[PDB]
Ligand binder design. Structure first.
Ligand SMILES: [Ca+2]
Ligand SMILES: [Ca+2]
Ligand SMILES: [Ca+2]
Ligand SMILES: [Ca+2]
Ligand SMILES: [Ca+2]
Ligand SMILES: [Cl-]
Ligand SMILES: [Cl-]
Lengths: 75, 74, 75
């Protein structure tokens, strides 16, 4: 929630944001969460994708990723 | 451990310091060590808590976490 | 790979640079890659070591590690 914590979450997102877009696809969400210490598996990742991929293009934004990590850490 | 290494250990601790208490409980220690690349399981984590939770309240400080990562890395 | 992505890869290498050399051994490569979200196993790590430990002393450099992570993140 703090600025220091938000930057660290941003570092994990920017590491696997290949095409310099503001998005990550399924595989990049898995390694990003694992880079933050969460051993997420395929059923959990697909559940998160379908919850946040509103336009249905296979990508989620950073603010989507920020809210995911917010739910995981604060709980 | 150098200043650069200690800062990185500090970043992993501050990420899972949920209430800014300067302390982490069992679950927060587990994900923090895994955030540093160590796949730790429940028996090892409980053994670390029992070693460093001297007050017996279910929390350890950063200097407890710093010493844990010191022996795991060095 | 942007300059900020290379800094994050450098942080993972420097965390397990135990003796302040420019090298990591088998075990230090395993945890360094796992610190970046890749849960690699023994056969893959030994495969990467054999490819990049050209001198054959059980160590690889940062530029070896940077190239490994470049291939992993860019599929
Ligand atoms: Ca992308
Ligand atoms: Ca990590
Ligand atoms: Ca706490
Ligand atoms: Ca205590
Ligand atoms: Ca070394
Ligand atoms: Cl999980
Ligand atoms: Cl002790």
């Amino acid at each position: 929630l703090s600025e220091e914590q938000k930057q660290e979450i941003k570092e994990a997102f920017d590491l696997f944001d290949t095409n310099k877009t503001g998005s990550i696809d399924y595989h990049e969400l898995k390694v990003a969460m694992r880079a933050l210490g969460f051993d997420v598996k395929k059923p959990e990742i697909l559940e998160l994708m379908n919850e946040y991929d509103r336009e249905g293009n296979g990508y989620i934004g950073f603010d989507d990723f920020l809210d995911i990590m917010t739910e995981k850490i604060k709980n």
